[PDB]
Design a protein around this ligand. Structure first.
Ligand code: NAG
Ligand code: NAG
Lengths: 265, 98, 49, 106, 49, 53
């Protein structure tokens, strides 16, 4: 269990993705869901999210917590604290890195509610949930007793045998919070040990690293003229739909996937 | 099958063209006049000269190894049988090809 | 939309032929994503049949 | 949209109990339907929320010990836009003219 | 499955005729219960009609 | 009201029953339900469970 968790967590880089429904209008939610698979016969759903599961924020095997990030700040939450639902409320089985396993009934949409200390933000995705029964006897819910047939459900085993995803070096992220308005200048202060590629739009456009110390931006007094591109690249990131592609970062890496569908009865 | 879309490539304040690579049913498109928006403000501050490079292809499903349907070419059936023969009070059970 | 949309000589064979009528559309303004439309999974449709 | 003292406070819900005026934070109280809703904003008497399709409207108000809710048999018509019948707004696609209740306080 | 699957001479009469095609099946391994399958209530069916 | 509650509670012995869906796989859950009656015209259901009230 340690090997694949370490492989996924050495180059995880949890992110926040664009979400259609943030429970208030639309926003970029750290809990945004990018893919849901509902091919399990019993109703189990295997889906991958921006947030990571199975380890803490320090890269230590801790499966009881959910790990995510907010605006470049990596944060973690207990798994039982955060729950997802559908047409009917679901039940979470387990999570492993990007991918998550849970027991959801049939539904037209997927939503997971993340309630922080004061801020409760949730992301909904219009993905249907196919609750396909087993055999020719159409049950809307698994029966308590009866005969058994061959069944295919997403096993919760963490083994990763014949499937994987590509993880690349993340592209540059814009961060206008780092832009500060000083006297006739902009003082974009990068955080500790962080390279903020400062891009300024005025007469004579300049691009600078300013990794250690902030730089005064002459001719670019207004804050909106200069745009700060945070550049950490501490770990690789999953090749997501919401992330920009760094042209100079051709850093593909295989990441074997958990919760592979397995046959059973 | 799992649809495979790469991270979009944006040429902020500039022009970019799709590179034709080889993937199953690979499609690449270039989109101009795009103003991307991120959580940390707008990613690109130029209005035009924002070419969007989007490439997508098709990958076989992750669970294809376990769950999948197989097509066969069927012909020339062979016939076999199990016979429990008893001749002369000699109870004999065996398989004999037809 | 029918059987054979994904064809692989072997389960472990990396080579595969894909024909799903995959076409992209215009990305929505203010969003970064890959807007694609294609026919549903022909294998899945056959299973539903 | 205001407190119990008539001051601009849009993050709270104001009500009364047996002639005693009391207030609650807006996020504290939620309504649901066939599926749980999402509350957008409130403005005095009128309230705006994002409810999916449902046959009845119910809002659960849980006080310190007493949880009281009211359910009304009013249908929720989730009428789509255009000739493509979708049960939930799509992630992407083309755009059409749509008529929705704007959240502006005008 | 029809009206009269349960017949009692009186409301308070203890004696009653029961014909529900009640048949037991195999209990599931590792579980303790009474696995029984029987027709739905004929009284209920008549009410539904 | 005291009489029938006392009569039930002198010989209650609450138990845990095998439950098909324990919110994780299957197990024996203390809150398991054995019978639900849904003939209430308004929608009210009278049900008996392992736990007592
Ligand atoms: C910033 O400090 C690092 C030492 O951690 C050094 O390698 C780098 O050259 C410094 N940057 C500049 C612009 O001097
Ligand atoms: C084969 O025939 C013998 C003689 O009738 C019988 O005793 C035996 O059970 C048979 N075997 C099977 C597998 O039926």
């Amino acid at each position: 269990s340690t090997e694949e968790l370490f492989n996924e967590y050495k180059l995880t880089r949890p992110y926040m993705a664009r979400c259609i429904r943030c429970a208030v209008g639309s926003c970029h939610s750290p809990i945004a869901i990018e893919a849901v698979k509902s091919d399990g016969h019993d109703g189990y759903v295997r889906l991958q999210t921006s947030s990571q599961y199975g380890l803490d924020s320090s890269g230590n095997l801790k499966g009881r917590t959910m790990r995510y990030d907010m605006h470049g700040t990596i944060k973690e939450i207990p798994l039982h604290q955060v729950s997802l639902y559908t047409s009917r409320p679901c039940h979470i089985v387990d999570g492993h890195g990007y991918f998550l396993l849970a027991r959801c009934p049939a539904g037209d949409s997927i939503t997971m509610e993340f309630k922080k200390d004061s801020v409760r933000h949730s992301c909904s995705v219009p993905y249907e949930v196919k609750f396909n029964p087993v055999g020719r006897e159409l049950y809307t819910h698994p029966p308590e007793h009866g005969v058994e047939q061959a069944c295919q459900v997403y096993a919760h085993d963490a083994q990763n045998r014949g499937a994987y995803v590509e993880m690349h070096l993340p592209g540059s992220e814009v961060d206008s919070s780092l832009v500060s308005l000083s006297g006739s200048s902009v003082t974009v202060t990068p955080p500790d040990g962080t390279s903020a590629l400062v891009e300024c739009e005025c007469g004579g456009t300049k691009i600078s690293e300013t990794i250690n110390k902030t730089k005064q931006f002459s001719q670019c007094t207004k804050k909106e003229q200069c745009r700060a591109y945070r550049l950490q690249n501490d770990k690789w990131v999953y090749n997501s739909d919401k992330l920009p592609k760094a042209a100079g970062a051709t850093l593909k890496g295989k990441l074997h996937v958990p919760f592979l569908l397995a046959d059973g009865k | 099958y799992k649809t495979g879309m790469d991270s979009p490539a944006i040429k902020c304040c500039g022009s970019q063209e799709c590179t034709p690579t080889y993937r199953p049913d690979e499609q690449c498109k270039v989109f101009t006049g795009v103003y991307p928006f991120m959580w940390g403000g707008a990613y690109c501050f130029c209005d035009t000269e924002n070419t969007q490079v989007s490439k997508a292809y098709v990958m076989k499903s992750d669970d294809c190894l376990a769950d999948h349907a197989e097509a066969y070419k069927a012909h020339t059936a062979s016939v076999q049988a199990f016979l429990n023969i008893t001749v002369g009070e000699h109870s004999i059970v065996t398989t004999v090809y037809v | 939309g029918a059987f054979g949309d994904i064809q692989s000589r072997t389960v472990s064979s990396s080579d595969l032929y894909a024909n799903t009528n995959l076409v992209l559309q215009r990305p929505k303004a203010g969003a970064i994503h890959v807007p694609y439309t294609q026919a549903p999974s022909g294998f899945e449709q056959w299973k539903k049949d």
